[PDB]
């Protein structure tokens, strides 16, 4: 999914081998914040939420507790008391296209920052000038989503 409409899978009623992920060579970033990485096979949790999306390489550092950016404010916000693991890996061989891959979007404009674990998929035209911008796009009326080429 794109980061403005990030997918969420509710992992529950199963047993999870976390050390087939932590011992995988593919992942460029594997940062567990509230929990030790090797202690995941012993701790038992009520349920897990897997939030999946695609971002830029330079925006991976914003997926962290207390960080601030485009993605942290308007796309995907983590709480300050976040327990969990952020896993990221380079997918240049999948999500990139010679003629451009404009299927991945991100919210550029929003009136306020997102609350932690809030999803905002509204594509309504951003009123940047507080003129009578009656839905039509144009001057001082911006489309809120930009495409990652």
């Amino acid at each position: 999914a794109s980061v403005y409409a990030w997918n969420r899978k509710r992992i529950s009623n199963c047993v999870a081998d976390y050390s087939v992920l932590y011992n995988s060579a593919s992942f460029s970033t594997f940062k567990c914040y509230g929990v030790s990485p090797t202690k995941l096979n012993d701790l038992c949790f009520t349920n897990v939420y897997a939030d999946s999306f695609v971002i830029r390489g330079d925006e991976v550092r914003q997926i962290a507790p207390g960080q601030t950016g485009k993605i942290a404010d308007y796309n995907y916000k983590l709480p300050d008391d976040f327990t969990g693991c952020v896993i990221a890996w380079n997918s240049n061989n999948l999500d990139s296209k010679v003629g451009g891959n404009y299927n991945y979007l991100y919210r550029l404009f929003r009136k306020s920052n997102l609350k932690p674990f809030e999803r905002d998929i509204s594509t309504e035209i951003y009123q940047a000038g507080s003129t009578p911008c009656n839905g039509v796009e144009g001057f001082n009326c911006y489309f809120p989503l930009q495409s990652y080429g």
Partner: antibody
Amino acid sequence: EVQLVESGGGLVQPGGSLRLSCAASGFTVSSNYMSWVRQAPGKGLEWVSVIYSGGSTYYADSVKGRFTISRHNSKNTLYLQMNSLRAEDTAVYYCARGYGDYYFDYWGQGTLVTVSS
Amino acid sequence: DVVMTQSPATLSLSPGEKATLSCRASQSVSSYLAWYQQKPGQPPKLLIYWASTRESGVPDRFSGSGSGTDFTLTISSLQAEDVAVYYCQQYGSSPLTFGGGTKVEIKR
């Protein structure tokens, strides 16, 4: 229609304080990305600070920890507080509306800040 | 950061000619580039953004090309009022860095 007017620039001692104001017309600064960009006399443009549409503020490395960009929503005004000024901060400062701190389509007229004893 | 290098530092062509201003990034900044025109004693005016897309109100003689490291600004017919300083500005990387500027001079 869109017009940005800076004020508050003037001569200031080194180590002094100065509060630049940028009044805007044609849009609301509380829902726009606004930057302060400075130009040294005889030199090129240099980006100083940005405030996002949600309120997040970012500063350049030469100005981080001294300057403070802010805005006041119920009068459509953008301010830049300037503290502990060194000799290299003598410059013309422009407030500029941005498209998500990417490019600045509308620029203010600019105000000159002189830092000398 | 990214060090933005403009060439030439001073460009002198007769009016009615085609002017090509080159900008080079120290890294690859994709098509994240804008160009600005600053008259003497006047704020900068945005000419093109996203390395190809003209700002509204900018005349059709301005155009842009290039990608990655190398970029060009083309003025297909230099007129009298284009004596200004032209800046390239990347915005892909985290610090917004401007170029050194190019002074364009009309040879009358």
